[PDB]
């Protein structure tokens, strides 16, 4: 339903190996991917042209054997499960890839902040600059920060517990399927963005 | 530059010694004195004055058993609206009145309710004319107005309200 | 800052506005008895290889 001029820049692509990223997908997924990144995928071997036989069934990369010996039949339940697994992996990758940015006020050049942060603020900035919606109950601070939350200025890190790990079976490729480490950098900013 | 010379010349008698004998030294002294007195009156006098009056009121309240903090908070609550100057005047010249104010603040007397928002009478929704009479809302407003008129002090208009409302009937000449 | 006599405001309370070890009570008090040659009045806990 895209416009023709916009669709001219995209091409239908079937994913062979699960790739994380704004232009990625799960193994056996059809998506409109941009020309440059789609050509990169097809040159690397992670993508295939969506023929009808391939839409029926596909071969995929096996992590254990390191070869494209995994034949897969594209079905509805398979698509649903793989989409959910891709969502879980994308959330993990987003929260484990880069820094989180906080900007607040602190009178003077002290080391502690004027107003300490909380799980609500952490989840707010997560949804803001990561586009990930989570509830504050999953955010568990460090042993020293269980009292007053994030208070130091500079660099800190918190734990975020992801419940859905063993149901989908991610414990192999992921470092730790139980929780993830969110690195948060807190700084002093101008008034309009500090707001406190 | 406008040096205040001809005005400050006449105040040299207040100074002493060389400032009073010579002219320029006395003029400099008077200029500095007036400038610093104006600065103090603008930015620092009110603080000291209000601190003094507050300390006096606090002492008068402590002689009864309370403090400036609780007294001020409860005055604001009861909505008495007495400035610290008046509180000091009462504490110094009307001890019985100040003690009665303290007793009012201490007692569990219900403070006045917030001012009621002006409401619209029910007759404003009545169709008029329903098919040379006055509007019902206007008549009720006039009645309340005449009531408020008679409520303020004694006057020869009388305490009744119907006879005072029906004054146009009296002024009307029978045709 | 100095806002009182040593009877009320100690000498180690001058840097109370600065953050760190000064906001605590010093361990050694050389202000009583004989005075030091270098005129040191307080010495905090020896943190590692540094002492204030």
């Amino acid at each position: 339903e895209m416009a023709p001029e916009l669709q001219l820049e995209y091409m239908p692509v079937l994913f062979t190996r699960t790739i994380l990223g704004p232009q990625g997908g799960f193994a056996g997924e059809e998506r409109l991917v941009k020309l440059e990144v789609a050509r990169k995928y097809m040159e690397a071997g992670h993508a295939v042209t969506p023929t009808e036989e391939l839409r029926r069934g596909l071969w995929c990369y096996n992590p254990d054997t390191d070869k494209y010996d995994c034949f897969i039949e594209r079905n509805e339940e398979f698509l649903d499960f793989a989409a959910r697994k891709r969502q879980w992996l994308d959330v993990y990758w987003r929260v484990n890839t880069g820094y989180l940015l906080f900007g607040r006020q602190s009178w003077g050049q002290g080391f502690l902040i004027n107003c300490p942060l909380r799980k609500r603020d952490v989840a707010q900035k997560l949804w803001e600059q990561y586009k990930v919606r989570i509830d504050p109950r999953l955010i568990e601070f460090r042993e020293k920060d269980r009292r007053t939350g994030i208070q130091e200025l500079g660099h800190n890190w918190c734990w975020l517990y992801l419940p859905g790990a063993e149901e989908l079976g991610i414990n192999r490729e992921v470092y730790d399927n139980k929780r993830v480490k969110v690195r948060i950098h807190v700084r002093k900013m101008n008034s309009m963005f500090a707001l406190y | 530059h406008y040096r205040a010379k001809l005005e400050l010349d006449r105040i040299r008698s207040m100074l002493r010694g060389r400032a009073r004998l010579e002219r320029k030294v006395g003029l400099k002294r008077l200029f500095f004195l007036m400038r610093t007195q104006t600065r103090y009156r603008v930015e620092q006098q009110a603080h000291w004055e209000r601190a003094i009056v507050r300390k006096n009121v606090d002492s008068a309240a402590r002689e009864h058993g309370t403090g400036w903090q609780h007294l001020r908070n409860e005055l604001g609550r009861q909505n008495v609206m007495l400035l610290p100057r008046s509180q000091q005047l009462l504490a110094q010249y009307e001890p019985l009145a100040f003690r009665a104010v303290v007793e009012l603040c201490a007692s569990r007397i219900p403070p006045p309710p917030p001012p009621v928002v002006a409401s619209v009478p029910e007759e404003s929704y009545t169709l008029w004319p329903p098919a040379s009479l006055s509007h019902p809302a206007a008549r009720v407003e006039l009645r309340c107005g005449v009531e408020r008129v008679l409520r303020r002090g004694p006057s020869g208009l009388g305490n009744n309200v119907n006879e005072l409302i029906d004054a146009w009937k009296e002024f009307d000449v029978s045709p | 800052v100095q806002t009182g006599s040593p009877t009320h405001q100690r000498e180690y309370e001058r840097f109370h506005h600065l953050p760190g070890d000064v906001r605590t009570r010093p361990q050694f008090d050389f202000t009583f008895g004989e005075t030091r040659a270098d005129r040191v009045m307080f010495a905090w806990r020896k943190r590692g290889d540094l002492q204030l």
Binding site: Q109 | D58, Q69 | -
Partner: peptide, 24 residues
């Protein structure tokens, strides 16, 4: 408040005004 490192130290006049009593 309490100035940090970069802010210069300024000595203000001691508050000599009369203070009320801190009742409990």
């Amino acid at each position: 408040g309490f100035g940090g490192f970069g802010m210069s130290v300024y000595t203000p006049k001691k508050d000599r005004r009369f203070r009320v009593q801190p009742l409990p």
